Amino acid sequence: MDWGTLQTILGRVNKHSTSIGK
């Protein structure tokens, strides 16, 4: 779900997890 009635708002895009530690 996105916006009161939309879509182009959030898509879990743009992120970084290459960082090591786990």
Q: Token pair 């743009």 is at which residue?
A: 14
C-alpha 12/C-alpha 6 separation (Å) is 15
CB 14 within 8 A of CB 7: no
C-alpha 7/C-alpha 18 separation (Å) is 28
CB 19 within 8 A of CB 11: no
CB 12 within 8 A of CB 18: no
Listed residue (19, 20, 2) closest to 11, CA to CA: 2
